[PDB]
Amino acid sequence: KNFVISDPRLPDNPIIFASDSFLELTEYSREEILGRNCRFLQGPETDQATVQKIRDAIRDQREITVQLINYTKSGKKFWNLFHLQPMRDQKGELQYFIGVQLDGEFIP
Ligand SMILES: Cc1cc2nc3c(=O)[nH]c(=O)nc-3n(C[C@H](O)[C@H](O)[C@H](O)COP(=O)(O)O)c2cc1C
Numbered sequence: 001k002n003f004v005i006s007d008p009r010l011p012d013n014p015i016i017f018a019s020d021s022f023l024e025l026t027e028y029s030r031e032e033i034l035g036r037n038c039r040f041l042q043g044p045e046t047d048q049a050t051v052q053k054i055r056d057a058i059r060d061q062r063e064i065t066v067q068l069i070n071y072t073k074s075g076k077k078f079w080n081l082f083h084l085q086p087m088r089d090q091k092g093e094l095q096y097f098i099g100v101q102l103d104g105e106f107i108p
Pocket residue numbers: 004005006013037038039041042051052054055058068070080082084097098099100101
C-alpha cells in the first residue's frame with residue numbers, strides 16, 4: 001500500500017509514482033512529490049550512517065531493509081522501516097527502484 005517508484009535513468013533518481021497511502025503518511029500532495037529524490041523525508045534526527053547504507057545498496061543495485069527517522073510536510077517525526085527493491089527489464093537492465101515504507105519504531 002505505502003510505496004514510491006524512482007527512475008534511476010533520470011538525474012538524481014526522481015520519484016515517478018507515489019501511492020495514495022504514501023501521500024497520506026507523508027502529508028505531501030502528488031504535485032509536490034513528482035520529480036524529487038526521496039531524501040526530502042530526511043531531517044536533523046535522521047542517522048547519516050543508515051543513509052550511507054541506502055546509498056551503497058542503490059550503487060550495488062541490491063535490496064536492503066533499514067529503520068530510520070523521517071519527517072512529514074508538517075515536520076512530524078516518524079520511524080520508517082524502509083524496504084528498497086531494484087527492478088530490471090527482460091534484458092536484465094535496471095529500470096526502477098521500488099521503496100516500501102512501514103510507519104512505527106519496530107526495533108527499540
Ligand atoms: C524508491 C526509493 C525510495 C526511497 N524512499 C526513502 C524514504 O522513504 N526515506 C528516506 O529517508 N530515504 C529514501 N530513499 C533514499 C533517498 O532517495 C536517497 O537515495 C538516500 O538518502 C541516499 O542518497 P543521498 O546520499 O544522495 O541522499 C529512497 C530511495 C529510493 C530509490
